[PDB]
Symmetry: D2
Subunit: 221 residues, 4 copies
């Protein structure tokens, strides 16, 4: 196991929390970002995670987080971009909400990846994993702005895989975040399924530029 830590952003979210806890259990040092002090952050601190405040809603918050991260570590085993914000398209607030989702889903991973490249290449095996949403396959009549920002994130996978090769592998996981009768398998998944996707990507040596779909066959249903 690497002694360089893994960063998981937005790890008070259900999926992020499970992944962070399992990485700690596996033996990784883990740094998390959080935007609200909560019982889940306490759970993470008690489990061994380093908890850094990160408000990814605007450029200045992203850069403040980056500065904090660099004080904390000079190497990273991986960055897992899990931070996610779903907002309603509330009338009169559509632009604000779309910009906020752009900031969380696209601006923050781009800036963190760009600024954190030297931390990742200080590690012998280095990975970026972008966690998006399987809604991008079809689009979303309801959640237009949300979906477009997750699609932008999936583009960053292809582009950073190209730029950062060969030293850093860059991949995605696209979970059906909503998640029963609309999937093929018809079962209720635990977050464990996302952790197993993450482990597959981290432990691989020959996989980059790819995105894992984790959606119980919703697309064939």
């Amino acid at each position: 196991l690497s002694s360089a830590p893994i960063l998981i952003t937005g790890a008070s979210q259900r999926v992020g929390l499970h992944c962070a806890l399992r990485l700690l259990e596996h033996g990784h040092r883990v740094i998390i970002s959080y935007r609200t002090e909560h019982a889940s952050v306490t759970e993470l601190r008690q489990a061994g995670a380093v908890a850094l405040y990160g408000d990814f809603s605007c450029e200045t918050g992203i850069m403040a987080f980056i500065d904090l991260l660099k004080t904390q570590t000079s190497s990273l085993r991986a960055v897992v971009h899990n931070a996610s914000e779903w907002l309603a398209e509330t009338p009169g607030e559509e632009a604000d909400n779309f910009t906020r989702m752009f900031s969380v889903h696209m601006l923050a991973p781009y800036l963190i990846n760009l600024h954190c490249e030297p931390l990742l290449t200080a590690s012998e095996v280095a990975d970026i994993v972008h966690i998006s949403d399987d809604v991008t396959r079809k689009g979303s009549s309801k959640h237009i702005a949300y979906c477009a920002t997750k699609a932008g994130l999936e583009s960053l996978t292809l582009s950073f895989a190209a730029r950062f090769a060969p030293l850093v592998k860059v991949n995605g996981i696209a979970p059906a975040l909503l998640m029963l009768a609309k999937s093929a398998l018809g079962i209720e998944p635990g977050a464990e399924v996302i952790y197993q996707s993450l482990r597959y990507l981290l432990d691989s040596t020959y996989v980059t530029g790819t995105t894992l779909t984790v959606n119980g066959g919703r697309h064939v249903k």
Copy 2:
């Protein structure tokens, strides 16, 4: 009867498309961000020219307000406005946000706010002009590519929301060219694509790739 809006029509591709639409008898409104001989050419050819700064939310909403004073109906909206910026060190966030605003925020707000203008037309279309770069991604133009990918998402999503009254489609040109075929493309290929989409009754949620077979070469 209703006009077709083409945004950013001082750009090479947009100028050609607007002129060709006028030649084909359409009424045309263009947006422009810079007074230029190409904008004079469009006014002289018959286009109504509206200023539009899509670099920020306030510019986008000011343009929407202006458009709505100009017309109560639209035959179509062609989102052609595009800005390619370098990833200059220290300006990456500003440039990414600006391209987000032009390529994603603007089409989304214009589409949302202009839906009643389009539905006032018997046949109504939205066309998003992206960039074939999204297929592969770009090591060099990461932010640009990502904003164009977001635009392509808007095609699927608005095609769904605006059914059955507004058809929503895309064209993805290899805007670097403006390849397997090894010819130099004129903007006419983009206009032919636009005509196919406008003239179809059926087609929605699709994106036409105009790239000279780059992806097979």
Copy 3:
């Protein structure tokens, strides 16, 4: 002014496209699997009507020979011939093979053997008509869908091999296997777009009423 070949064109969509091409002023060759009133309609309209049995290599090579007696050039080949067969128990392999023969073997052999006819024309196209079913797959029509997916791969590969002299593209219409017309006309307009384009190769046009967003 070189002729356009459209295969399997007593099928309603092929019939429509052939007739529209003739009205547009093209010389048109059609293939047909069985003699039928619409074949005489096509003859009457100006089409050069040729028998083509795409069931097996022999039938396909017979057709290619026959074609090459008619013309030394082609403006385009439109692979429209399509056969849907049920997955009848005990006949699944025979039916899968037959659909492979019509949808994959025939376009492959025709393209390979007719490349010189196409390169004799200043502008040359191949258009593969598949079926929009390939995007999602089909629980029921597994074999049919797989053969249509194989045909779509031929677009990419022949586009690469035949560049720059022949443009190779697809049209993937929805519900083609359910056809007994806006649908046929949208296919014709897609064909016209492809034939008339100058910078488009390796692509597949989806024609499906927005089914994939619905």
Copy 4:
């Protein structure tokens, strides 16, 4: 205790995957075309080695019958059998038909006729091993590529049909001049070993919420 079938296990990838599965403690049945040292090795490691000729319907159906005399259940079927043939002048149709038989007809009939063996197992998987060439197409290997693309369609379609009881997924690996060129065209600049495909297989077998997907195992050739 239900066995995993890997077809075409003389091949380099299938051989490795079969050996690793046996090492992991699974029972394994393999198919083979010809006797080879690799078949002896598989037998010695504990594989049940069955003859199978996937060149035509008769041979495929004979293999299915033979499998049914060997086991009343399957944990998984991994369709690894693959045939690459040159587009030899005057043999194009023969070769395209043969590759259709191995890559499309065989997995189709095997899946259709062996579904009951799979549903005898509590967790059941079908895995289609295709080839990453399908993404771009191939100027050279047109027929081969088209048969591999047909196989990838079978993933989507059997995933729909066989849900919820059987998960159906694919692995699309980047299967001398050709190697040198392909490596330079990969992003990671590594030559892969078959272990990369075994890890993909383990991910699919061990997952619970994944069906209808295809894993791309290609060193980032598509982004370079």
